[PDB]
């Protein structure tokens, strides 16, 4: 079995490189963040532009949805995060305290916490309702590329240019686990598997790895794409066949069989580094987005 993703829409309108795309948990919306300092909301099924959300003074590197699809959190080069009420577009909070670029962000499943990582080498845990920083973790010795909560919000995984992935206890803020590899290439992305038992980690040696973090064992590797320069996010695709999905610096979307590690499809049509991909939570739909030469978002659909 192989997927047959086909281009359905190309969404133009960001005036600089796109940095991330995320589907709302309820499946209704796609959100995109850009170096052009904007967030844009699009209809997930018809591609229709919904609205522009603005207020960051510098470009945005990441955006994330609350579990109830009502809020967005964005991370900016202006060293802040912002919490936005989606239906109004109003900024609800500005999260202040990082001393350098904010690179990555996520809500916990309860959506009372936001986790963030920054070029200042720290991971911060923020109270959503007050906007107050609850904890500053001295997580890494170089910029933090990714932060992600597990299924119940009791753990955080972080990754850094320093070459490490770390598993943190959310309530105590203590490091429970450090994944150390020889040759320690920079880690450009990490996230928990849907069941929270594994982590998917990208390194800037053109390599994705599926790890048992409790066992400290690497179960799968995925290769064939190009990832040497940029923090490209990867996804678990679970609505049809079980795939691994990632952008690539050769302008393609790559799709691997999760179990066999074979490449099952390559999506062509972007004209620059595909910096971000996202998988729709209920339909076999992929959103992809690209850097300065392209600046577009593409929606793809498959029967499996």
């Amino acid at each position: 079995v192989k997927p047959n993703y086909a281009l359905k829409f190309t969404l133009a309108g960001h005036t600089k490189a796109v940095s991330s795309v995320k589907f709302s948990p309820n499946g209704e919306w796609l959100a995109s963040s850009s170096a052009d300092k904007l967030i844009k909301i699009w209809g997930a099924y018809d591609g229709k532009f919904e609205k522009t959300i603005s207020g960051h003074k510098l470009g945005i590197s990441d955006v994330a949805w609350s579990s109830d699809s009502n809020l967005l959190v964005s991370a900016s080069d202006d060293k802040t995060l912002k919490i936005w009420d989606v239906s109004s577009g109003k900024c609800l909070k500005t999260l202040k305290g990082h001393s350098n670029y904010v690179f990555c962000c996520n809500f916990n499943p309860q959506s009372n916490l936001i986790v963030s990582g920054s070029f200042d080498e720290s991971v911060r845990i923020w109270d959503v309702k007050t906007g107050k920083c609850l904890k500053t973790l001295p997580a890494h010795s170089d910029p933090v590329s990714a932060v992600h909560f597990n299924r119940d919000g009791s753990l955080i995984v972080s990754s850094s240019y320093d070459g490490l992935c770390r598993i943190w206890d959310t309530a105590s803020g203590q490091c429970l686990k450090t994944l150390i590899d020889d040759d320690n290439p920079p880690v450009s992305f990490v996230k928990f598997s849907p069941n929270g038992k594994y982590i998917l980690a990208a390194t800037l040696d053109n390599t994705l790895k599926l790890w048992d973090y409790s066992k400290g064992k690497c179960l799968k590797t995925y290769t064939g794409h190009k990832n040497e320069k940029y923090c490209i996010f990867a996804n678990f695709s679970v609505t049809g066949g079980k795939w691994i999905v990632s952008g690539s610096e050769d302008n393609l979307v790559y799709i691997w069989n999760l179990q066999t590690k074979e490449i099952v499809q390559k999506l062509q049509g972007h004209t620059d580094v595909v910096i971000s991909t996202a998988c729709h939570p209920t339909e076999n739909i992929i959103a992809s987005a690209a850097l300065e030469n392209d600046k577009t978002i593409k929606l793809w659909k498959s029967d499996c």
């Binding site: 490189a17 170096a35 590197s61 900016s76 080069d77 920079p186 320069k229």
Partner: peptide
């Protein structure tokens, strides 16, 4: 720009 859209390095 944004740091995500630039090469990843300190």
């Amino acid at each position: 720009g944004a740091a995500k859209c630039r090469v990843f390095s300190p």
